[PDB]
Amino acid sequence: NICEITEVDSTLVERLGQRLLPWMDRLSQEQLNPSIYVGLRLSSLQAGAKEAHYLHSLKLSYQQSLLRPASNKDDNDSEAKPSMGQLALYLLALRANCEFIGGRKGDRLVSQLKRFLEDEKRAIGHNHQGHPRTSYYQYSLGILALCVHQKRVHDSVVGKLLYAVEHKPHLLQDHVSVDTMAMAGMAFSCLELSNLNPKQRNRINLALKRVQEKILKAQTPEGYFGNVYSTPLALQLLMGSLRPSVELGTACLKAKAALQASLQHKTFQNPLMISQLLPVLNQKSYVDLISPDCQAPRALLEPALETPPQAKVPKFIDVLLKVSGISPSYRHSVSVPAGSSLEDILKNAQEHGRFRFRTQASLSGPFLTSVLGRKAGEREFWQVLRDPDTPLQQGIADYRPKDGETIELRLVGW
Numbered sequence: 001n002i003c004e005i006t007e008v009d010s011t012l013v014e015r016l017g018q019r020l021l022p023w024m025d026r027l028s029q030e031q032l033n034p035s036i037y038v039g040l041r042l043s044s045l046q047a048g049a050k051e052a053h054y055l056h057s058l059k060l061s062y063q064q065s066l067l068r069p070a071s072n073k074d075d076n077d078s079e080a081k082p083s084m085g086q087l088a089l090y091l092l093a094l095r096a097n098c099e100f101i102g103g104r105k106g107d108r109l110v111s112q113l114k115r116f117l118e119d120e121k122r123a124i125g126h127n128h129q130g131h132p133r134t135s136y137y138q139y140s141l142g143i144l145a146l147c148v149h150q151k152r153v154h155d156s157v158v159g160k161l162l163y164a165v166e167h168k169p170h171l172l173q174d175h176v177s178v179d180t181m182a183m184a185g186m187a188f189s190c191l192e193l194s195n196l197n198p199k200q201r202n203r204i205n206l207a208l209k210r211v212q213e214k215i216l217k218a219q220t221p222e223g224y225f226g227n228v229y230s231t232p233l234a235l236q237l238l239m240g241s242l243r244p245s246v247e248l249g250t251a252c253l254k255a256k257a258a259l260q261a262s263l264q265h266k267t268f269q270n271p272l273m274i275s276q277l278l279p280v281l282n283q284k285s286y287v288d289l290i291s292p293d294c295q296a297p298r299a300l301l302e303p304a305l306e307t308p309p310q311a312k313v314p315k316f317i318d319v320l321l322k323v324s325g326i327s328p329s330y331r332h333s334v335s336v337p338a339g340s341s342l343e344d345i346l347k348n349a350q351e352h353g354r355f356r357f358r359t360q361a362s363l364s365g366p367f368l369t370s371v372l373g374r375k376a377g378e379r380e381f382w383q384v385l386r387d388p389d390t391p392l393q394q395g396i397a398d399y400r401p402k403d404g405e406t407i408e409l410r411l412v413g414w
């Protein structure tokens, strides 16, 4: 397929996999990541005996956290439960090991996911006013995860996603847009291939064409679909063909070229990003989880085991931190070694000054939730920008500021 990546340098692929490798040893509840496991299984690489151990740890964690103790011992909280979107990714990890969800525990998890989607459908409502409590991204992911296990949702559930894709100047905010379209597209694709909602067949077919149209519309002059980090998900979808056009073929050539050029510059550091990219580089997508091949050999991944000693005096950078959207504005000047993350900078400011911040765990790493005591509310988030007004494309743990940058933390409501 013209949208498939064929010409990748194997040593670049190995380098990407090597970044995932140490995560295979990070087995705590808040570090376990079903997306990383899926990513490796659909790649051309393997982390040996570490993989099965990782999946056993996922099985233990998700099952014990999400299932039972009915009369919960004086708390109603303490454990750090995975979310329902995270449960969907867990269902994808099972498929990646060529398993179907089964037994009583399995049926219980399936019910919890179906209930999540039903609660989301009702939050949307009558089709008009109402957003999901989470996102259309997670809604799409839930449908897809049930679908690859051959579990059906009601026509009305699929209907809310179809409507969201269909109706006018579209619902989707710019940040989520390409990624959500790609994930919606993959759900539709699974539903079409599996014939789970036959009464919606034609509507699903048309929505698939519409998703492709919107993704192409979002191609940047560089050739990314949306941005570099949404390009792997979009290519996961577009490799699934359907409607081959010359416009699509041309778009895909530009996108693969842009993605390849970006890989030459160590662009992908975030494990979750790598996990979405590795399948594309092996001509696979989440839709392949309908009938996975666990018999196909993968190349063994070994660590670097070297680590570069300069024995030097490092270059320093001067950065200005700024906080806006709260009543008294805050600014902080720090000088740090070149290569320090924004997270390091925030920790430095908290240590050597009156800055304070809090994060919560996510599959993408530390998510910024509070700044100077102000926790982000219900439909609010702490947006991270390079001044002026340019939202960053990496989170706090991965963004490495350059000399003389002013970074802004802005409480916004989207």
Ligand code: B12
Pocket: 083, 084, 085, 086, 089, 133, 134, 135, 137, 138, 175, 176, 177, 179, 180, 227, 228, 229, 230, 231, 233, 270, 273, 362, 363, 364, 365, 366, 367, 368, 369, 381, 382, 383, 384, 385, 391, 392, 393, 394, 395, 396, 398, 414
């Ligand atoms: C929906 C979404 C959001 C929502 C999430 C809130 C909501 N109502 O759900 C909002 C709008 C708040 C958001 C914010 C941001 N996002 Co966002 N987001 C997504 C999206 C579309 C889906 C995430 C999801 O639900 N995944 C599934 C569930 C099961 O996973 P999860 O880990 O449990 O989900 C949580 C995290 O993803 C977290 N989150 C969302 N975005 C980001 C980004 C980072 C870096 C981290 C650590 C966490 C995080 O919110 C989710 C819980 O609500 C992804 C797309 C993708 N390809 O993954 C982008 C994506 C993860 N976001 C991205 C970015 C860059 C950001 C921001 C840094 C943008 C900015 N400059 O402020 C901020 C985060 C800043 C912060 N406060 O730490 C990038 C990350 C790229 C990279 N190199 O890692 C992605 C890949 C999109 C893209 N193509 O650029 N995001």
Ligand SMILES: [Cl-]
Pocket: 267, 268, 269, 270, 273, 394, 398
């Ligand atoms: Cl990254």
